[PDB]
Structures are given as structure tokens and as C-alpha cells.
Amino acid sequence: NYEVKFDVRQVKLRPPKVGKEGEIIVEAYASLFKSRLSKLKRILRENPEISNVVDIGKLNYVSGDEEVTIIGLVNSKRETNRGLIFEVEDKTGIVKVFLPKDSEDYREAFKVLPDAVVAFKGFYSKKGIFFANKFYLPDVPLYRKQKPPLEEKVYAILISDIHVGSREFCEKAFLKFLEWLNGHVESKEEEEIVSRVKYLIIAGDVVDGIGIYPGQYSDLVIPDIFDQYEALANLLANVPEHITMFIGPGNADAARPAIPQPEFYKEYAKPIYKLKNAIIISNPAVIRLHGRDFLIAHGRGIEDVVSFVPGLTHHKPGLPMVELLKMRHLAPTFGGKVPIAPDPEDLLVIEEVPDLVQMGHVHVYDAVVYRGVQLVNSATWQAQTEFQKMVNIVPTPAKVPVVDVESARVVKVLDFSGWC
Amino acid sequence: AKERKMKPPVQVLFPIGLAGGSSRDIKKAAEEGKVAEVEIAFFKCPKCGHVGPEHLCPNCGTRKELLWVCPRCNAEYPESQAEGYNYTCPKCNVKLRPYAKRKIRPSELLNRAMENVKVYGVDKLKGVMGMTSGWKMPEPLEKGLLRAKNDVYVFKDGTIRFDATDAPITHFRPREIGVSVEKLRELGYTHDFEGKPLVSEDQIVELKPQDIILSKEAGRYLLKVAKFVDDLLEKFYGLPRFYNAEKMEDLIGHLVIGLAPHTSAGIVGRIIGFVDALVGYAHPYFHAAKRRNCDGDEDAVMLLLDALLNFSRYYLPEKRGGKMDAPLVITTRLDPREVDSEVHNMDIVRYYPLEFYEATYELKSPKELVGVIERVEDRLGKPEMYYGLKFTHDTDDIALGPKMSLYKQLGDMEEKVRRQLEVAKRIRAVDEHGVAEKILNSHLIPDLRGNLRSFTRQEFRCVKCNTKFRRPPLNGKCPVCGGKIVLTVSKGAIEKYLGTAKMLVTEYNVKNYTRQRICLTERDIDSLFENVFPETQLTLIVNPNDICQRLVMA
Amino acid sequence: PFEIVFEGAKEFAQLIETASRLIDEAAFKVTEEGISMRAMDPSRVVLIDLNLPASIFSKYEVDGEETIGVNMDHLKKVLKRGKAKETLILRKGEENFLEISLQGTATRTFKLPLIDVEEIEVDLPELPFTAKVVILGDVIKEAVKDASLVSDSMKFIAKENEFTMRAEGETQEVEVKLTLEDEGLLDIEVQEETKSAYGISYLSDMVKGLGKADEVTIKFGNEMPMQMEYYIRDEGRLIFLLAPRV
Amino acid sequence: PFEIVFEGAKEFAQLIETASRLIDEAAFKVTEEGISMRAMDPSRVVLIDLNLPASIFSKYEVDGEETIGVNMDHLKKVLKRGKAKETLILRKGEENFLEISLQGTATRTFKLPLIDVEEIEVDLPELPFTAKVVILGDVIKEAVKDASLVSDSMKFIAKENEFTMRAEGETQEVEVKLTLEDEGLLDIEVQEETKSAYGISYLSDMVKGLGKADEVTIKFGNEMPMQMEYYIRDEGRLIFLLAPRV
Amino acid sequence: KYAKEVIGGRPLFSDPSKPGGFRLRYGRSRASGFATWGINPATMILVDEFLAIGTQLKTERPGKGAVVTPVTTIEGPIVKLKDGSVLRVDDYNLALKVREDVEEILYLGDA
Amino acid sequence: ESLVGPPGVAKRIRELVKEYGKEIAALKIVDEIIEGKFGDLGSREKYAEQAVRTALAILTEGIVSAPIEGIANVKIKRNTWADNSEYLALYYAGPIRSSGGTAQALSVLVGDYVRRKLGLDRFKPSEKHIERMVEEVDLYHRAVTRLQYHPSPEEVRLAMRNIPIEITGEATDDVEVSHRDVPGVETNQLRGGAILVLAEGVLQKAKKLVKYIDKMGIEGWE
DNA sequence: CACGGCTCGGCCCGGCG
DNA sequence: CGCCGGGCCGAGCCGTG
Ligand SMILES: [Fe+3]
Ligand SMILES: [Zn+2]
Ligand SMILES: [Zn+2]
Ligand SMILES: [Zn+2]
Ligand SMILES: [Zn+2]
């Protein structure tokens, strides 16, 4: 009982023509942030606490004593001695907001990423500034209905960052994973788990790719992108046919050079499509398993959250995931180290609050629940790269999160690093 | 051997602001009669009380005293007064500025200029958008008119420079440089390098230290500088002409200050002829004392009386002392002692001795035999540093050979690489078919990939509100402007080298890694835009054997 | 080693311009039957087919058959220097030059170094063309210029006894209908419903150089290339082949 | 839901251009009496007053009264595509589009999405105008083009039975005198000495589009705005109102 | 080092220390010597006129950055004409005469 | 004398070079500078300025603009983190790269000598000084411009511990650093002047440098 | 440190007139 | 023959490599 709920192939986009090609693009990014502002705006306006919403351009028509709420894109974010000075911009115009140091959501406003959609409750000074008292992120429902329990326990497993072909690939540990699913386990408990795992998921970088960075060629055991995906097919082929696999690209696969990513290039990735028991999904994607909502991303933007949030350090990668879940958007940064492809309609936005969040691409294992959400980072299968050494990276290879479907929760953090 | 044109070409140092348009052409601002607001310095006629940015009075013709300004109280004080006040206001505790953002009537000024120097037929007179000097004292317009009238350009100090790749010589056959043996007898050259009396135009003379053989480019431009300096002596200063140059061969004997970049001490030199190539020759003591490396370095060459008449530190920009600088002082006598180091190793032997040639075979390091072969360190101190050098190999001409590289007559990268790599099939040595590509092919891969990575992280910018929002405004309008925002790194840039780089891969055996990288980057360029530039125009003749598709069919 | 004499050099220069605005080089298959041209754009989107029967020339002297290779740009500037009625002559002997002689009030001689042209021959005979229409020149010329306002892709719709053109952009809409009843529509041959779309740019390159006294043929089918044709002095006509879009 | 039929589309496009060169958008107050226009430049320096009595139209069908809101630029490109004698038609039904039908040799249909125009109505009736002169079109057109040489502000001087224009720059001087005796000065109505100055740019936007067979009216007083007028097919005339300088 | 970077349009004249590149001759002509080289103008023409009088060709042995300057006495290229004949081409004018038939430049000759 | 003065200094420099050469006559002139033979400069930092400029000028033979374009300033500071003792702080500028490593390196030597003649103390950086400096090394080499010689970090701290004078100046690029707001370093950006003088100078040409130490017999450089 | 693309005025038209 | 809307080019003018 699976379902590919959200998929970027599933939706269709249409370019709005206006001799110069550039004029059509610029427009295209404009439409992108447009659909952003509409989507997140709508989500904030589904909040009960948020009332008296107004256009920012009309803040002159509202009294300095009427309590109004504004929803807008955070242009900039400048902290000072008395609080924070934002420049929120909605579809009408631009306004500079202030939050005092001693408001309740002041930490929240401290950890918000620029270019997001936020909501403010407060009072617009006639001086040309909006003095806010309350901060608002699209965030998540605080009281969510439980679900009907399932007929019996069934499991799904988390993995990502296979990075096939790179000589850093801890092939042996992965091989003992494949044995592990195949019942050749060492406890009766793990045999019951394996008895009932029906689902496997893989969130990007399933081959280490080609030309991903200067000197990748030194590291490639298999310097042939075709052979990377093909050999990957030969690994995953040994999966028991009574499990279903879902696979999504990353920034290393043969997929789009920005996000979102519709799918693997069929020309290069044909070998894995041929798999009978796998289902190739997009980035991001969302899969409803027995009514369970699994948000799946490869999560380029965690590098953004840690890039802009001093006070979130590595080895604790549940925190950035909590950030991205809190802004309901998978990479609301722009122009940093995550590439956002000029489409019309932002597909990245976390539309529905899901049950569970899977990411990867930093290989630092972590799990954390926020407001009934199971954030989890399926770390890797790659030992630390020399390149990862030069950038101060420390993998946690061969760590496999085990998840029950029913409670939508991580149950058993396997570790196989002893086989690498 | 180009000229030295500022990036916006300049012809007079007079701030004009926006009032001239894009190229800050002052004469447009004049005939258009606009009025300017530019920081400038004004002087005040003590006799009459006239005020204006010029040096001499219109009323009475005496020198005008500088006017100082408080930026707070806007107080104006003649020079001696602000000398007393130590250039700080009496009722303001602030330093007195020399200049102020002011109102300039380009019309009446330029009219006074044409009235003064008697020149009217100027096509344009390109000015300076804004004085960057500390004083921001402007050049007199008359000099700008004379520059324009002769079409010579100016550089930041007020001197006219002329870059030329410099190369060394030490002996020259007067046939080569086009000079009469009697003339050379007039410059001092008595006897050729073997001491024999100079009688014929085919004896190798020894170049004396500070002579230089300019390229006929430099003749053809410095000639214009000569007509400038004459017309400036006469029409503006009211003096006798000085060069009387009519052909380039009139300049022979007139001094030119050779100046490097990066330095501030130029060397006086003398011109003794011309050649045809684009390289200004000189005795290596010259090229060294000018601090050159002569590993391809490029140098400036201004005329003497020009740099005297037209230079003043007041024009020197105040902050960015860059890669070029101005002749703060000029040397008039080489001494190869305090010149440089790299000269001190030249081989000045008439022929390398037998002991050397046999001494190479066992790969002796060079210092193991420095005592054998004469050098320049082995003549310092003695008077015979200048007297006699030598050289092993004769040339026939110093200029014989193709006088302009084929690189500059090649327009399109598409066939740029086709020439660049056209050659390498010809030679035995290069072995293109595998490495001229792959080295060069590696370069193609890096630029395209870099642009592609960057594109998704770019910035935006309007033509009129330079302010580029790190994001598109949903409206597409702009501040101040009601206009549109242009894209910084345009999609024409990403696709600029696919034609070549695809060509190389379809022709030359290149390692599969780079091939798959390139076809793969093709697919990435397409799928990066599968939702803005959809696939619309079908084509009728499909697959002319493209390496990408025919590769994938494997 | 031939010589050729054609009158009304300005006309010939016009048509050579027409061929010029799409390709940059091309070869002329001169045969004793006549002068022939055939080439395709760089984009592989349009096919120019020039056919010149020797009859059109006031004098036609070919000895054998040979292929000329010329810079269409240089020839375009040259021929463009001819005028209304001055006589055109094309001579070629042993050397690798083409001699163009413009003699009206006086004689003027030009020489053009012939250039090798790598020939990619793709002959495309009659194809399944659902509809076929003849129409005055300025009709289509006006129409294309109109579609230039609102979009970059002009859509053609051929229905029974009725020919209609259209194009739509963001907001604006452009439509041009006309039938046999209308004056400018000389003929319609409707087999059934036909519809296509074409690059308005390419069409603009096509129809420029058309007076009101210019009849044009158009064969095409549902989502397939157009073939346009028009005669030149009633003997040698030119034919373009434009691939559709989408 | 109206329809309108006007002949000589090129003329109407010319006048719409005239209105176009000063404002970018504008609304058309269509009434059963006729089509009306009234708007002001961005600079608040000139007032364009268009008056179109229904009589001028070969057919005039209005059902009620409504205001059209159109992009003067888009309409300008559209109408500009009409020619000398082809017939103009303006249709509007339920939807929010304007349908322009150019039918000469053929019919061509365009559609323009109407745009909302925030109306700032400033009606300025007759005002104290000291002098009032009629003059041929090309006279003033030549004159303005002359003052373009020497300056940017053209000065007008009206004396008893004599009309003189002038402008001065840095050294150049331009003067244009003419009286009732002269041919081009059809009329002068001198109440007393009048003098003003006006932006030569704005005047250039005004008088462009004037043949020799164009009569122009000019009312104005000492240091106050000019009002220019000229008729269109003898029924509906256009009137500009230009604020002076200094 | 010199072959590390290859900008487009910048030719490569000989692989490092490969026999067929600029055969070496110690010496110091009238022009050269400070830091430049000399070179037979024939080899400046048979390379299709890329090199000029001063084009800084990046060297490898003696030091990066040698300017070029003509020296007619040293020995220029050895070429292979299209018809198979092998020709020693020492002087300029002969190089102009046979630049068109150069099927292969065996030896760039002196420096 | 005409580049950087002081007045009359040429007459003396010709003699002193007549007896001792270039290098030695440099230091002799330094002495007569601080001894006031050419008149009073005023404050101690003005004597520092004059002697440093004339020194480096005579050393590079006055043909470059390091003595003018390069050395931004000269200051006297205190080891306020270590013991509050005085030391000498040199403010370079980016154009010093133009005059190459050697002239850069000699700028160190004079900077060491002058403060000694002025009875000043050695410099004693804290580890935040040192590590911020090495950070400047890696970033400046990585992104701004590739140094001719890229030294290891240990070598960098070596110099940082072993140069008695401060190699500093105004920051040259908009590149923020991690060891922000170190005592006395009034900017948290990369200082390409101090960086280049550090790496391409004393490091890249330490051989020739100790050649000048040997020719001048100046202690403290073993 | 150096190249190409992109857009901008200034001449240079061909067609309407 | 004039004008005027388009064409072609020289000029910034940027960017990035
Ligand atoms: Fe990863
Ligand atoms: Zn990844
Ligand atoms: Zn006076
Ligand atoms: Zn004051
Ligand atoms: Zn703007």
C-alpha cells in the first residue's frame, strides 16, 4: 500500500512568453518567487493566531494603533543592539520591520533564513518602520490527528549518498547491508524486523558522478558515468523482490544541474530504471505509505542553514532539518551554495505537513522529532574523501535508520562501519 | 605598440559629470548648453574679483588665488587667508577643502577656450567624469582643444604615453634603422664596433647606452605629439615652435622619457632611428634601469618636452597608486651598478670559448664556469662598462619577419581553435591528437561548467539603477527607474563554447572522461532550460552524427 | 570556362539576397540545362531550392557542368551594387575566379575568388501535403509582419475553401482570415483540415522581397514542414522548405 | 458592446500617434455623442484634449457610454500597421477585449486587452488668452525645427498685427517674423502685447504630423500656457495645453 | 610548467624536451640576450605567422617568458612539402615561397 | 633625495656608498637620520617614517614605488595583550606586490632595525594574532591571488613568532576572517599587504634576505 | 589577468511617399 | 526628389572566465 503522492513530473509548468531571450528568463525567476509568495502566504493565512492581514503597500491606510499582520519575503536580515531589522517585501511593496530583543519569537527570528516567507503581527509606525511584537513562520500544526494503526508492523529503511564508483565507497559494509536485508542476520529481533520491512528509499548521489569538483578523477574507481549507474544496478539488483525501492537524484547524479530535479536522465540512468522492484522518484518527492507522508529530499540547503546560522554545528544535523521543516521550504536561500533552477512555480515548498523527513548529502547521521515530525538524515556509505578532508568533513558511513511505518518513527539505527 | 588610451578615452582633464552623456563629451554639453554640478576648484582674480575655474584672469590677466571651502559653513577664503587659518574654519572646526561640488557653464568656458587658442573645428572633446586628484584642480581647456585638434590622448598625470613591448639590442647596422651615415656622424657615432672608422651603411655600430630605436608606430604617434607640443608652445604659451616635425625622421635626436609601469622614475633617452616591427629597442642598461624583466614586459614612452609642459602632481589620483605611475623624477645618466641585477649576467663575449662547449657535456651547473665567460659584473666600476660589449650571432635585419601576430586577425573562437590546433597537426613536436585538445579541451570544460554552476546563483542589475537585487523583484520594475532588470550572466554566455568543445571531441582522440563530461554537460544545458525555452522548432535533417547521441547509442 | 548574360541585374540581386538571408555560403551547380542552387540553413530548419532554367538568360553559354563555390555575403554586396536595368554578365575561365561584369552606362568588372563548399546534398521530393494554397505576395508579407507584433511562432490553419492565419502571445491576439471569395486568395486546394506552426523569424526571412504582383504557393500538412514556392520570370522559381515547431 | 467604422485608418493612426508621443496610457470616454479623450503628460506640463464627434465616422454604433482603457503604445503599433485607405473598425462585446478590424484588400482582426486607467480628471475651460492666432502647419513646424538648432526653449511674441517667434542660445540667434500680410499667417487677433516661452521638446512632440494644408489655432497670454488646436476632418479637433517656463 | 595552461588561440609549439622542438644554440645575437630569444624568421612564417617580432612565447628550460627576435644566421625549420619532398628552409623569402605546400614541419629549428 | 628625502641626504649617501657600498651606507644613513643630522623631524614616529622610507629607498635603489606606493604607514604600538611594551607596526598596501618580494623582504629588515635604533621592543603576538594571520594566508592564497610561494601554516607561525616587527596595514579585500577583532588589528578582512610581505617576501626570498643580514651583520635572524 | 555576450547611439539605408 | 523605420555598425559596458 504505497503511493507516490508528490512528484515534480506529476505537475506541469508553462513558460509565459512576453527577440532577447534574457527578458523571458528574468520574468521566469520573477514567476518563481511569485508562486513562492502565494504558496507560503496561503499557508500562513491558514493560521488562527494570524488575523488582520494587510498589504504592505497599504500600511499608510492602517492606523498606528491597529494590530495588523503582514506576510512577506524576507529581503534582508540585519541584527542590532535592540533586536532585528528586516526588510520584508510582499507583492505590493517593501517595508522595514523591527523585532525587539525581548519578544517571544526573537530566537525564531534569529534562526530564520533570508528569502523566506514570514508573518509579523504588530503596528506600523508612521516613521516608515513596522514595529512588530510577534513573529510567524509557516511552521507546522501543533495538534495533529493520530492515524489508524495498521494491520501489523511493516518497516521501511533509510539510506542515501551511495556515491557508487568513488574509491571512498565502503563497498563491503554495503554488501553486508544487502546480506542483512536477505535474512542473514544475527539476532531473532533483527529477523522479525527483516520479516516485515517492505520499503527501501535512497535520497540521492547514488553514483559519485563525473566532474563534480576539481580532481574527482583521482578518486573514481569507475571513471565512466554509464558504468557508475550500471554497477549500481548490479548492487541493487540483489534486493529481495518483496521490497519496493524508491530512488531520487542528488547533485551528483546524472540529473538537472539545479533544483528541483525531475528525474534521472534516461539516457544515462537506463540501467536502474530497468529494475523491477524499484520506483524512480523525483527530488524532492513525497510518498504516502499506508497513509504515511514521507518527505524525501536530497537537501542541498542544509549547507545553507549551517552556512547562515552560527549556533548550528555539524554532527548534530537534526537542527538544520528542524529549520527547513520550520520554514516549510526546502531551500529558501538564493544565490548561495544551493542552485535553484528557473522554473515558473516553486515546487520546493513544503506544501503539506508530512509525517517524516528524510534527507542526506552531508552524511552526518541524525534523527529528531519536532512537533510530531521525524526528521532524519540517512548519512552515507562513503568513507571520508580527501576532498571532504580539505573542507573539514567527517562522515558517519554505514549507518542505516530503521523505520516502522505505523508510528512514522525511526526504531533501530543500524551501524555497519566495522565492515569498512 | 598601441597608444595609451584611458578606458573611456580622454582628451582633457576637466570634470564634467553626467553633463556630457555617456562618453562625457564636453562639446555636447556645450552645444546642448546644459549646466553641470561637479566638484572643482575656483580661483579669484584679486585685481578684478572675477571667479572661475581657470588660472589667469579674464578681466586683467593676472594669476588667480585658490579658493578654499568649509564643507559645513560653505565659507570661501583666498589662499593666504586659509593659510593663516591652517585650512580649518574659524567658526567651524573642520578642515578647509580646496574644492566644492559646483555649477559649471560648459558653454561660456569652452567659448573662452576657443577664443583663447583660436581653434574651433573639434569633432568632440572627451572630458573626465570626475576629478579623482586630491585637489581636483582641472586642466585648462585649451590643452584639451589642442589634444583633440591633433587627436592625441592623455593619461592620468597629463602626459601622453605609448606602450610598446620592449626588446634589447646592443649593435645595429644603419641599414636596418633607416639613417644616413652622416646623420649618425652627427649624433656622435664615430667608429663601428671593431674600432674601424664608420664609412658605410653596413658596418655594425655599437648602440650607445641611452639611445633607442622606436617602432614606426611610435614614430607615427609621437609625430602627433610633436605637432601638439608645437601648437601648445605657440598658440597657448606664445613661444617659438620646438620640434618642427613634419616626417617622423624629424624626431631623430629628440629625447623621450622611457617609463615603466609600477615605478616612478623614468629614464631620459634619445631617439636614433626607426624600425618596422612593433617593439621599441634599447640598450639593455636602459631596459634594466627602467626596472624591466624583458620577459615580455611593456613600457611607456613619452616625449620629453611634453612631460615637462603637461605634467603636474596635482592631477595625480589621490588613493589608488596602481600598476602605472608617473615620472616623479627622471634619471639622466645610466650607471649599470645601481640599475638592476638581471643585466649583470649577460654574456658579452665575442664567441663562447672551447672550454665551455666541452664543459657542458657533463652538465656542469653554470656557476661552475662563470670565471671563463665574461659578463657585466666582471666590468662594474671600471669605465669600460659602456665602452665595448659584443655578441656572438649576426642578424641581417632587426626587423625582418612577420610584423604582426596572426593572433589578432582571428575573430571567432570556433575557428580560433581551428587555427591554434590547425598548426599542431603540422609539427612533429606537439602531438595535438590527444593533448593539444585535452589541455585546451580541459580549459573549455572549466569555463562552461563554471558558468553553469554560477548561473543558478547570479545577481540582477538595471542599466540605470546600477543597484542589482540579489533576487528578481516580482514586478520587474526598478528603484528611481521605472524600468526593467537585466540578467547579469546571460544564457548566451553558457552556450558560448559548446560548438567548439563539441567539435574537438568529435575529431580528436580525447580521454573518455572528458568526452562523457562534455556530452553530459550538453544534456545539462538542455535540461536546465526545459521549462523556459521549451523544445519548439523541430528540424528536418536529424542527427548529422553528433557525438553525444551517437555516443549514447553505444 | 563559361559565360552568362542576364538582364535586369537588380532583380537577380534581389533573389540572391533572398537566398542570402538564410545561408552564408553555397555552391552553384551550373549545368548546360541551367544554373541550380540547393542548400540548407545552419539550423537545419529551412531548405532553399533555387532552380534557374537557361531560357531566362539573354545569353547562356556553358561548356560542360561545374559547381561554383562563392561567399554569399561578398556576392550579395557585389550584386547589390547593380541597378535597375544594367546588364549582368558572369564569366569564368581557367583561373579560380568568377568575373562579374555590370554593363549599363558603362562596364564594371569584379572578380571573386571561388571558395570550396563541402556539399551536403539532401534532395527531398514531393511529400504528403494535405493543403495547397496560392496567394498574393503582399498578403502573406503583411500577415507575417502582423504576427511579428504578438509572437514568434505563426500558426497556419487551412480549412475547406478557407485559409486562415493566426498567432497569440501573452495578451494580444492576431488573426488573418481569407477565402477564395476574397481577392488576395487566388486558389485553395483543401484536402482536409491542416494546421501547423512556424518560426516567424524564418518566415520573415522568407517573404521579404515580395511585391503585390507576386504569387506564392504553399503546400503543407498537419504538423509538418511547409513548402513555399514562387516563380522568377515565369521559368525559374524558388522553393523554401520550413520545418514546423512543437 | 459597441461597433465603430472609420475610414482612412492611416489618418486616425497618425492622430493617435500624436496623442501617443506625450502620454503612455489613456482612457477613451466613448459616449453616444462621440469618442472623447483627455489626459495629461507625466510631467504635468501638457494637456491633450481629443474630441471626436460621431459624425466623422462612416458608421457609429454605441449602446450606452463606457470608458476604454488601452495601452497607447500597443494601440500605436497596431493602428500604425494600417495603411492609406484600408477601413478601420472598432468592436467590443461582453469580454474585456477590444477588436480592431483592418479591412482593405482583406480583413485582419486584432484584439487588445483593455487596461484599467486611474482617471485624474482636470477640465480647464476658456482662460484669459491675450492673443489668438491661426497659422499654416508647416510654418510652425519649420519654426520649431529651427529653434531646435539654437536652444531648448522657444519664445513667442505677439504684437499688433504681427506674430514673431524667436530663440537664443549661447551665440546663435533664431528669429521668425510674419504678419497678416505674409501668406502663412492666416489670422491674428491682437488684444495687446503677449510674450511667452515654451519647451521646444514639447512643441516638437506637438507639431510633428502636420502638412502644409494644416491650420492651427494658438491662444495665449503673457507668461501663461499656450492652447493649440487643429481640426480633424473639420469636425473633431485636438487641443494641447502647454505650460510656459520661468 | 608552460604547458600547464593553454588559453584558446595560444598555440603550443613543442612538447617539453621533445626532439623536434626548438633545437638549442647557446649564444647571444645582437638583439637577444637580456632575456629574449632569437629565432630564424623562417620558423616564424611556417607556424602560419603566429609568432611575430616580440610575441612572448613561454619557455620551459632557461626561464619562463622569452620574447622572440629575429636572427637570420641560425638554422630555421625543416619541412615536408605536400608532394613528399623534404626541404630545408633556412631563409625568410624561401619560407614565403613554400608556406602554402607545407605538409609537415619536422623540425622547428634553432633558438 | 627627490623621491622621499630628507633634504641633502643624497650628498651623504654618495659618500657612505663610496666607502661601504649600498647596504652598509643604508644603515649609516639610518643612524644619521635618528641622530638628527638633517634636522628635527619631531615625534618619534616621524623619525621612524623618515628613516624607514629613506632606508628602503636606498635599498631598492629608488627605482620602485615600494617606499612610496607600498608602505602605507608606520606606527608605534604596545603589547597590550602581552606586556604593554612598545613595538613597530608597518602598514603596507597591495601595490607592494608590484615591487616584488625582495624589496618587500628588505622592508622587514629596516622595520626591524629602526625600532632597535629607536630603543623599541620586539613584537610578541598572541595566538589569535598568529592564527588569524595564517588564516589570511590560506584564504588570500585560495581566493584572492595565488602567491608565488605558498608557505605551510607552520612556516607562517614560525615567521609570526620570529619577526620582531608587525607586518600589517589596511585590509585589501572584502574577505571577513574568523579571528575577528584581535587586539590592535582594526579590521577583520584579509590584509593582502601584510600577507604578501609575509609570504612572498621574507619567506620566498629568505636566502637573499640573510645575505643582506650577513652584509649588514644584524643580529636576531638565525 | 582577458574573452565574449549584450545593449546603445550614430550613421546608412529602401521603401513609402 | 524627402522621411522614416529598419539595418548595420562602432561603443560602452557590463559581466563574468
Ligand atoms: Fe552525500
Ligand atoms: Zn548529493
Ligand atoms: Zn581681473
Ligand atoms: Zn565653517
Ligand atoms: Zn532601474
Author numbering:
A (entry chain A): 196 to 213, 218 to 619
B (entry chain B): 662 to 1215
C (entry chain C), D (entry chain E): 2 to 247
E (entry chain B): 329 to 439
F (entry chain B): 52 to 273
Task: Give the article text.
The bacterial sliding clamp is referred to as the β clamp, whereas the eukaryotic and archaeal sliding clamp protein is called the proliferative cell nuclear antigen (PCNA). Clamps are constructed from either two (β) or three monomers (PCNA) to yield a ring composed of six domains, which share similar protein folds. Hence, across every domain of life, the extraordinary efficacy of the replicative polymerase complex is dependent on their interaction with sliding clamps, which encircle DNA and greatly enhance their processivity. We have shown that PolD uses two distinct PIP-boxes for molecular recognition of PCNA, which are located in the C-terminal region of their DP2 subunit.
Here we present the cryo-EM structure of the DNA-bound PolD–PCNA complex from Pyrococcus abyssi at 3.77 Å using an integrative structural biology approach, combining cryo-EM, X-ray crystallography, protein–protein interaction measurements, and activity assays. A defining feature of the PolD–PCNA–DNA ternary complex is its compactness: the radius of the PCNA ring and the clamp-like PolD DNA-binding domain match perfectly. Interaction with PCNA nearly doubles the positively charged surface formed by the PolD active site, making a 60 Å-long DNA-binding site. This structure thus rationalizes how PCNA enhances the processivity of PolD: interaction with PCNA perpetuates the interactions with the nascent DNA duplex when it exits the PolD clamp, thereby preventing the polymerase from falling off prematurely. Although the DNA bound by the PolD–PCNA complex is predominantly in the B-form, interaction with the PolD clamp causes a distortion of the DNA region located next to the active site. Although PolD extensively interacts with the nascent DNA duplex, the PCNA channel exposes several positively charged residues, which are pointed towards the DNA backbone and make labile transient polar contacts with DNA. The cryo-EM map shows how PCNA is tethered to PolD through multiple contacts that involve both clamp-1 and clamp-2 domains of DP2. First, the α-helices, α-40, and α-41 of the clamp-1 domain are connected by a loop of 17 amino acids, which is hooked into PCNA. This loop binds to the canonical PCNA PIP-binding pocket through an internal PIP-box (iPIP), which has never been identified so far. Strikingly, both cPIP and the linker are not visible in the cryo-EM density of the DNA-bound PolD–PCNA complex.
